[PDB]
Amino acid sequence: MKFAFVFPGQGSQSVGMLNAFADVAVVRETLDEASDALGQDIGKLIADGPADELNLTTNTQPVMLTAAYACYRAWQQAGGAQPSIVAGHSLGEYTALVAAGAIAFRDALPLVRFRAQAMQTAVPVGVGGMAAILGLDDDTVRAVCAEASATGVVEAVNFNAPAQVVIAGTKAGIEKACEIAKEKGAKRALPLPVSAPFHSSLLKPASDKLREYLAGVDVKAPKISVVNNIDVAVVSDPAAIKDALVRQAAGPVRWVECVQHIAREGVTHVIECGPGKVLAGLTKRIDGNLVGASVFDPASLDEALKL
């Protein structure tokens, strides 16, 4: 049977999340490689935090790439087969590209640090943010945003599961969209503790910086199919992969569609590779015939080896 690996992004991290892998030689070597690339002790940052350091986005993005990739390398060290198709959620798309051999891990490290810096400084402080809307289908959330937009730009920017949508834009747009969403019967419509309007058109300046940065990155044709967040496309051309990463930052993460794409390829097993269990839960919601597992410690890895 064919399987997919999906890789998590920001928001899946926690202090101590790799403790259970502390004595797996490849996890140690991956944390060493990350520290060498970034100039700080990534192992201890993850193990000890504090959470306020671990949650700075300039740390969170390389931390989540490292932790999830560590988990991929442990899967291999254990003799796990290559998945037939991969994807990842926002930052996680980078990890997927690394697993697929498109971007060397050593290159991916300063790339995602830079991406974090770019995305955090694209718009002036306090201009915008993000919110989570629960209970409304995608087209209703789009209608909510189109209506709210008279008060400021606001867009539906993460399609995560049925009835689970994140929006992003101006502070005013986000507030009005929550209010409208509630009126239309949303189970929940609440601002997220995020300081920048990620995956909105307001983030175009981040895309522009990413384009300049990726110009100098050696991207290779993947050895595993990667389905991208922005277009739900599987592309092999290095230039196209780069462009999908550029547009990704200021465009919608079509996560539901990526999972459905994977399913239409005849994959029935979808394994979340990395900590936090976020993607595991979304797979269940997107398509209950899919069979989930997760690799985040040695025990879960062995159960995933079975599936």
Residue numbers in the entry: 0 to 306
The paper states:
Here we report a functional and structural genomics effort that applied saturation-level transposon mutagenesis and next generation sequencing (Tn-seq) to identify essential genes in B. thailandensis, followed by high-throughput structure determination. We used an “ortholog rescue” approach to maximize structural coverage of these gene families, which are likely to be essential not only in B. thailandensis, but also in related, but more virulent, Burkholderia species, such as B. pseudomallei. Using only seven Burkholderia species to select orthologs of essential genes, we solved structures for 49/406 essential gene families, and for 56 total Burkholderia protein targets (including seven ortholog replicates). Of these 56 targets, 25 satisfied criteria for being a potential antimicrobial drug target.
